[PDB]
Every structure is written in C-alpha cells, then in structure tokens.
C-alpha cells in the first residue's frame, strides 16, 4: 500500500526547509483563486467579504518516488501542515479551515483550499455603468522573497467559471497582475499577484 510510500518521504523531511536541491535556486509556485461568492458587499465600510478556493501548485524535490516499483501508485493525498508550503497569505486583508494536498510521483503538489477574505474596496465612478467598485485582492508570501519563492498566476484572469452570479453585484472583470514590492527592510523584492475585481448593479 501507499503507506510504505508514506513510510516515508517524511523522516528525511520536515516542513521547515525549502525542498530545492540547494538553497539559492528558486522554488516557483503557481497560484490561482476561484471566486465562488460575494458574501456581502459592505458598501458603507467599503469592505468586501468573499468565499474562495485557492489553488497553489509547486514541486518538492524531496517527496519523489518511482511509481513502477511502488505497485505504480501515481499519487497520494496528505496533510498540508505536513508538507512545506509557501506561506502564501492575503496582503490586502482588513480583518481558513485546513485540508489536504495531492502529492504526485514526480514531487508535484496540488493544494486547493478555501478562504474567507475581508479586503478593502474603492470607488471612483465613471468607467460608468452608474456604480463601479474596485476590490483588489493581493496575495504574496508571508516569509519568502522572490529569490526564495517566486509566485505566478495560472492565468491573467481570476477564475470566474464557478462564480455564482449575485443578484445585486455583477463581476465585470477579474484580471490578474504581477508586481514586486521592494520593502526598505532588505532583501530582494516580494512578488505579489493581484486579482482585481470590478462589479456594478441593476436599478
């Protein structure tokens, strides 16, 4: 069974050090959100509350096994707190429920996970329709520069597809943009993607 694959990959590994062969090469990560719902467009504090799923994909050079000789098992699901994760958080926050990861034979990891976010929104209205509201969602790592971890969007839109058409608020766009943030503390820039949500409403 796969428990002798899981025998494990985990005596010579614990989530602390980045699973690259040696330190000063880079571990990239693919990131995309799947917007599910606008829980509340708090107009009068300009806070957007939203339910989301967060896709993060990356390679762990230490969690590889040859499949043929483990009775050909392609991949296992395992605890996120048990594998190295890019501690990728919400930069844009204003004010979340643990799951598991699909690790592949080639050391590829796929973590979807759900989120609630209170993020700030801004109005400046024309680009009419009557009322557009811009709500940016900026994600980036909590502990790692682009020289330890670079982070890419899966595509230059935030996935609506399984978006769930709210009755007063209308997603017109959700483009993504990739920036670096400098930060006077030090030490290389901090990569960050920004899903930018633009809504209006029927009257």
């Amino acid at each position: 069974y796969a428990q002798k694959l899981f025998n494990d990959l985990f005596e010579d590994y614990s989530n602390a050090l980045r699973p690259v062969e040696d330190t000063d090469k880079v571990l990239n990560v693919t990131l995309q959100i799947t917007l599910s719902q606008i829980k509340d467009m708090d107009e009068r504090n300009q806070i957007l509350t939203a339910y989301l799923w967060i896709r993060q994909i990356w390679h762990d050079a230490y969690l590889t096994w040859d499949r043929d000789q483990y009775d050909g098992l392609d991949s296992i699901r395992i605890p996120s707190d048990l594998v190295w994760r890019p501690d990728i958080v919400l930069y844009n926050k204003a004010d979340p429920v643990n799951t598991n990861v699909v690790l592949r034979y080639d050391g590829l990891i796929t973590w979807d996970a759900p989120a609630i976010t209170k993020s700030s929104c801004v109005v400046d209205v024309t680009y009419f329709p009557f009322d557009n509201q811009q709500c940016n969602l900026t994600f980036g790592s909590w502990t790692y520069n682009g020289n330890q971890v670079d982070i890419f969007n899966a595509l230059d839109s935030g996935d609506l597809s399984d978006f769930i058409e709210d009755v007063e608020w209308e997603v017109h766009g959700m483009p993504a943009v990739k920036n670096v943030i400098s930060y006077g503390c030090c030490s290389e820039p901090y990569p960050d993607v920004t899903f930018t949500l633009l809504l209006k409403r029927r009257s």
Binding site: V180, I181, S182, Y183, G184, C185, C186, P189
Partner: protein
C-alpha cells in the same frame, strides 16, 4: 539621467525618459513596516513629487543617486 527604478525585478538601473530629469525615492508604510521595514518606490520624475503626509521622500539630480537602502550610491 540614469535612475534606479523598483518596477524591475531584480532592482537595476534605467535611463529615465526625456523631461524626467530627477531621480526620486519614496517611502510610506504598509503595516508590514514593523516586520519588514518601510515600502520603497524608486524611479524617475520630471518634477520632485510633492506627495503624502508620511514620507521619507528624496530627490536627486546626479546619475546613480537614488539607491534603495541596499548599499551606497
């Protein structure tokens, strides 16, 4: 003029546009400030940007002259 611009990853040197003769430095605050000090925007400008209530803004007219707190000019 040749200024450092932070639009670039990694940080590096650019020759500013025509008419934008000054190099500048902008620093406001995230609230990552405590954790990773101060956010820095380096670039070019035609006139030194007047700006904000809370800054560590700096102009210069020399080549070289707006480096991040990285090292020295």
């Amino acid at each position: 003029i040749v200024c450092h611009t932070t639009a670039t990853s990694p940080i590096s040197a650019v020759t500013c546009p025509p008419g934008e003769n000054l190099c500048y430095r902008k620093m406001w605050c995230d609230v990552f400030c405590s954790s990773r000090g101060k956010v820095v925007e380096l670039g070019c400008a035609a006139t030194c940007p007047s700006k904000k209530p809370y800054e560590e803004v700096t102009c210069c007219s020399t080549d070289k002259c707006n480096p991040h707190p990285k090292q020295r000019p």
